[PDB]
Amino acid sequence: PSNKDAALLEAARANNMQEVSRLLSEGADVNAKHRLGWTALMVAAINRNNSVVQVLLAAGADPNLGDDFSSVYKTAKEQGIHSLEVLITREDDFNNRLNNRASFKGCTALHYAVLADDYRTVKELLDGGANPLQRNEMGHTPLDYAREGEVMKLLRTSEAKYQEKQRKRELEHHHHHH
């Protein structure tokens, strides 16, 4: 990606609030994508940077994009680079607390906030239009990745409300409200 998009991903990772705002005003893509597959919103979410998540959503970030990163091993093959570089970059530019063996293809920012078990980040994404029913490539919802506690309770409630809005054909009504 461009210099501005690359700086935005780093500022979103680093919780550098001033820089995120600056870069967006200079034309950085709010859906900026790392060469290895993830967005600024995803990396803000896994790092519990709920203030960065707020800013990106306000500038129009799509909450429902899925990660193109799969696993260290598979992504390394699909890109023709060695797994060592992929592992270091995933750990250094994204987050170092995830399972290196697992596949994350199709994970949304909400999947990642749930793995981070952060109530505030999860709530901000749900309030921002994140679809709690959207599954990743392995077929898991964000609630599938929740641990017991306040995030799992919030997701259970939100799933039921989202399903009811979908059945009543009124998702767009509620999206344009507070």
Residue numbers in the entry: 131 to 308
Manuscript excerpt for this entry:
SKD3, also known as CLPB, is a ring-forming, ATP-fueled protein disaggregase essential for preserving mitochondrial integrity and structure. The two isoforms differ by a 30 amino acid stretch present in isoform-1 (exon-5), which represses the protein disaggregating activity of SKD3.
ANKiso2 crystallized as a monomer and is a monomer in solution. However, to our surprise, the structure of ANKiso2 markedly differs from the structure of ANKiso1 and is entirely α-helical with the long β-hairpin undergoing a conformational switch. Unlike ANKiso1, the crystal structure of ANKiso2 closely resembles the predicted AlphaFold2 model and superimposes with a root mean square deviation of only 0.541 Å over 143 Cα atoms. Notably, the concave surface that was previously occupied by the α5 helix is now bound by the C-terminal helix of a symmetry-related neighboring ANKiso2 domain. Notably, this stretch is flanked by two β-strands that undergo conformational switching and form two α-helices in isoform-2, providing a structural basis for SKD3 activation by substrate.
